[PDB]
Write an enzyme that holds these catalytic residues in place. Sequence first.
Site, short mmCIF file in Angstrom:
data_model
loop_
_atom_site.label_atom_id
_atom_site.label_comp_id
_atom_site.label_asym_id
_atom_site.label_seq_id
_atom_site.Cartn_x
_atom_site.Cartn_y
_atom_site.Cartn_z
N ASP A 87 22.07 18.31 -14.98
CA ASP A 87 21.13 19.01 -14.26
C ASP A 87 21.45 18.43 -12.64
OD1 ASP A 87 18.74 20.71 -13.79
OD2 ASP A 87 18.25 18.92 -12.44
N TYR A 91 20.46 18.40 -3.83
CA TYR A 91 20.52 16.88 -4.25
C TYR A 91 21.92 16.15 -3.43
CZ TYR A 91 17.56 18.37 -7.78
OH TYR A 91 16.41 18.79 -8.58
N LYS A 97 20.95 24.86 -8.69
CA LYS A 97 19.81 25.55 -8.09
C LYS A 97 19.94 25.89 -6.76
CE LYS A 97 17.08 21.98 -10.74
NZ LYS A 97 17.60 20.59 -10.36
N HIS A 144 15.14 27.37 -7.28
CA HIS A 144 14.65 26.03 -7.07
C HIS A 144 13.15 25.75 -7.11
CE1 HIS A 144 16.26 21.59 -6.20
NE2 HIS A 144 15.21 21.44 -6.79
N1 LIG Z 1 13.44 21.32 -10.16
C1 LIG Z 1 13.02 20.38 -9.52
O1 LIG Z 1 12.37 20.63 -8.34
C2 LIG Z 1 13.24 18.83 -9.64
C3 LIG Z 1 12.33 18.27 -9.14
C4 LIG Z 1 12.50 16.88 -9.56
C5 LIG Z 1 13.64 16.41 -10.59
N2 LIG Z 1 14.31 17.19 -11.05
C6 LIG Z 1 15.36 17.14 -11.93
O2 LIG Z 1 14.77 16.08 -13.02
C7 LIG Z 1 15.41 14.62 -13.10
C8 LIG Z 1 14.74 13.84 -13.56
O3 LIG Z 1 13.36 13.37 -12.70
P1 LIG Z 1 13.28 12.35 -11.81
O4 LIG Z 1 14.26 12.08 -11.04
O5 LIG Z 1 11.94 12.50 -11.24
O6 LIG Z 1 13.17 11.07 -12.76
P2 LIG Z 1 13.15 10.83 -14.34
O7 LIG Z 1 13.93 11.05 -14.95
O8 LIG Z 1 11.76 11.04 -14.66
O9 LIG Z 1 13.12 9.16 -14.29
C9 LIG Z 1 12.45 8.40 -13.31
C10 LIG Z 1 13.16 6.77 -13.57
O10 LIG Z 1 13.04 6.33 -14.63
C11 LIG Z 1 13.97 5.32 -14.72
N3 LIG Z 1 14.74 5.19 -16.19
C12 LIG Z 1 15.54 5.83 -16.76
N4 LIG Z 1 15.58 5.81 -18.12
C13 LIG Z 1 14.76 4.72 -18.35
C14 LIG Z 1 14.44 3.75 -19.68
N5 LIG Z 1 14.85 4.09 -20.71
N6 LIG Z 1 13.50 2.93 -19.28
C15 LIG Z 1 13.02 2.73 -18.12
N7 LIG Z 1 13.12 3.57 -17.16
C16 LIG Z 1 14.00 4.26 -17.06
C17 LIG Z 1 15.14 5.82 -13.74
O11 LIG Z 1 15.61 4.53 -13.26
P3 LIG Z 1 17.08 4.01 -13.64
O12 LIG Z 1 17.94 5.00 -12.92
O13 LIG Z 1 17.31 2.78 -12.51
O14 LIG Z 1 17.40 3.75 -14.88
C18 LIG Z 1 14.40 6.51 -12.93
O15 LIG Z 1 13.84 5.92 -11.68
C19 LIG Z 1 16.20 14.91 -11.60
O16 LIG Z 1 17.19 13.81 -11.23
C20 LIG Z 1 16.62 16.26 -11.42
O17 LIG Z 1 17.82 16.52 -11.89
C21 LIG Z 1 14.26 18.59 -10.84
C1 LIG Z 2 14.37 16.19 -6.76
C2 LIG Z 2 13.26 16.11 -5.72
O1 LIG Z 2 12.06 15.20 -6.24
C3 LIG Z 2 12.95 16.85 -4.64
C4 LIG Z 2 11.66 17.20 -4.22
C5 LIG Z 2 11.55 17.18 -2.73
C6 LIG Z 2 13.15 17.01 -2.39
C7 LIG Z 2 13.47 16.34 -0.99
C8 LIG Z 2 12.94 17.24 0.30
C9 LIG Z 2 13.35 16.95 1.57
C10 LIG Z 2 14.87 16.60 1.46
C11 LIG Z 2 15.39 17.05 2.60
C12 LIG Z 2 16.72 16.84 2.98
O2 LIG Z 2 17.10 17.03 4.01
C13 LIG Z 2 17.64 16.01 2.04
C14 LIG Z 2 16.92 16.23 0.46
C15 LIG Z 2 15.58 15.77 0.59
C16 LIG Z 2 15.22 14.31 0.56
C17 LIG Z 2 14.99 16.30 -0.86
C18 LIG Z 2 15.54 15.37 -1.99
C19 LIG Z 2 15.09 16.00 -3.28
C20 LIG Z 2 13.55 16.06 -3.18
C21 LIG Z 2 13.19 14.65 -3.33
#
Ligand SMILES: NC(=O)c1ccc[n+]([C@@H]2O[C@H](COP(=O)([O-])OP(=O)(O)OC[C@H]3O[C@@H](n4cnc5c(N)ncnc54)[C@H](OP(=O)(O)O)[C@@H]3O)[C@@H](O)[C@H]2O)c1
Ligand SMILES: CC(=O)[C@H]1CC[C@H]2[C@@H]3CCC4=CC(=O)CC[C@]4(C)[C@H]3CC[C@]12C
EC number: 1.1.1.-
Length: 325
Positions: A52, A57, A86, A119
Site C-alpha cells: 500500500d 507518500y 491513491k 485518497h
Molecule cells: N488512506 C489513508 O489515508 C492512510 C492514512 C494512514 C495510513 N495509511 C496506510 O496504512 C499504513 C499503516 O498505518 P500507519 O502508517 O499509521 O502505521 P501502523 O501500521 O499502524 O503502524 C505504526 C507503527 O507500528 C510499528 N510496528 C510495526 N510492527 C510492529 C510490531 N510487530 N511491534 C511493534 N511495533 C510495530 C511501526 O514501527 P517500525 O516501523 O519501527 O517497526 C510503526 O511506527 C501506512 O503506511 C499507509 O500505507 C493510509
Molecule cells: C499517511 C498519513 O497519515 C497522511 C495523513 C496526512 C498526510 C500528510 C499531510 C501533509 C503533507 C504534506 C506534504 O507536503 C508532504 C506529505 C504530508 C506530510 C502528508 C504525509 C502523509 C500524511 C501524514
Amino acid sequence: SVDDSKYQCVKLNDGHFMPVLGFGTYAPAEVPKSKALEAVKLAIEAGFHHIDSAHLYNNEEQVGLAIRSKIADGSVKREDIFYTSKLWSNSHRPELVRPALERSLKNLQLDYVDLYLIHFPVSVKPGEEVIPKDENGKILFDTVDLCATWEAMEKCKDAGLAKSIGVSNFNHRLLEMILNKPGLKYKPVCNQVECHPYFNQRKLLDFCKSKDIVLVAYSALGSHREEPWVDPNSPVLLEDPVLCALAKKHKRTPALIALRYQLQRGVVVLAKSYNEQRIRQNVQVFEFQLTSEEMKAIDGLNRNVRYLTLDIFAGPPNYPFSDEY
Ligand SMILES: NC(=O)c1ccc[n+]([C@@H]2O[C@H](COP(=O)([O-])OP(=O)(O)OC[C@H]3O[C@@H](n4cnc5c(N)ncnc54)[C@H](OP(=O)(O)O)[C@@H]3O)[C@@H](O)[C@H]2O)c1
Ligand SMILES: CC(=O)[C@H]1CC[C@H]2[C@@H]3CCC4=CC(=O)CC[C@]4(C)[C@H]3CC[C@]12C
C-alpha cells in the site's frame, strides 16, 4: 517455506482477489524516502503480497523499484503482488484523474496498479502543491463532484491502468453517494479507513459488509504517531493491557493480536514497519487464532480514539469525520 505459492486472499466485488495482510509504506518526514526501497524488499521476502502506497507518500519511485527488483530476481511474479496507489485531492477534477494515475505509474515503472483509491474526499485546488494555501495560510479548497471523479476512476479501470478501484476515508453518506450514482459502472471494492481496537468502526464496517465492500484497516497498530498529524497524548494502542495480556497468553505480541483481530472480523489489515524483525513478526498473523471470548474482549476496547483526524481538511461538506459514521 512449506508452500509460499499460496496465501490468504479475499474476493472483491469486481472478481479480483486482495491479499488480506498488506504492507504499509508511509514513513515520517525525518526518514529518508530512500529507506522505503529496502523495507518493501524485506516485506516481499517475508511473505507480504499486498503493498500500500500513494502519490502523497512521495515513495513511489522506491516502492516500484523494490517490486521490480523482486520480480527481476525471481522472488515473486507481478500477479502475486497486489499494489495499491491513491489519487491525491489536488487531482479530483475528472480531467486530472487519469494524468495522476499515469504519473504514479511512470514513477513506479509499472504498467498497472492493482488498486487505485480516492485518497481523501475533500478536494483542493489543482497544481503542483499537494496542500495549496492562500496569502492568509488558508487551504484552498475546491468544489468537485466526487461522482464525476468516480467516473474518471471507472475509465481508468476500463483502460486497464487499475485492475480495481476503491475509496479511502469515506463515510456512510459518501459511500451511498457513489453507490446511488446515475449510471454507476463499478462499485468501490474497498473503503480504506483508520481501524484498530480503540476505533473498531463496527457501524461503518457493517455498512460496508452489507454492500460487499471490503474495509481495509490503516493505522491498525495505532499509527505512525507523527506530529502534527497525531496528538502525542493520544493513548498508545500497543500498550493496551488487554492486548498485552492476550499477547502474553498466546506467546505473541500486542501488534499481532491487533492484526489478528482484524482478520477474524473480515477486515483486510495493513501494517507498516521498516524494521526487519517487525516485518517478519507481522506475517505471524497467519500462525495463530483468537477465540470468541478473546474477540469479545478486544471489541470491548472500543473507545472513540481517532488518531488521524486530518482536521486541516475540516469545513467543506465532504469532510468525512464529523458524521457519526
Ligand atoms: N488512506 C489513508 O489515508 C492512510 C492514512 C494512514 C495510513 N495509511 C496506510 O496504512 C499504513 C499503516 O498505518 P500507519 O502508517 O499509521 O502505521 P501502523 O501500521 O499502524 O503502524 C505504526 C507503527 O507500528 C510499528 N510496528 C510495526 N510492527 C510492529 C510490531 N510487530 N511491534 C511493534 N511495533 C510495530 C511501526 O514501527 P517500525 O516501523 O519501527 O517497526 C510503526 O511506527 C501506512 O503506511 C499507509 O500505507 C493510509
Ligand atoms: C499517511 C498519513 O497519515 C497522511 C495523513 C496526512 C498526510 C500528510 C499531510 C501533509 C503533507 C504534506 C506534504 O507536503 C508532504 C506529505 C504530508 C506530510 C502528508 C504525509 C502523509 C500524511 C501524514
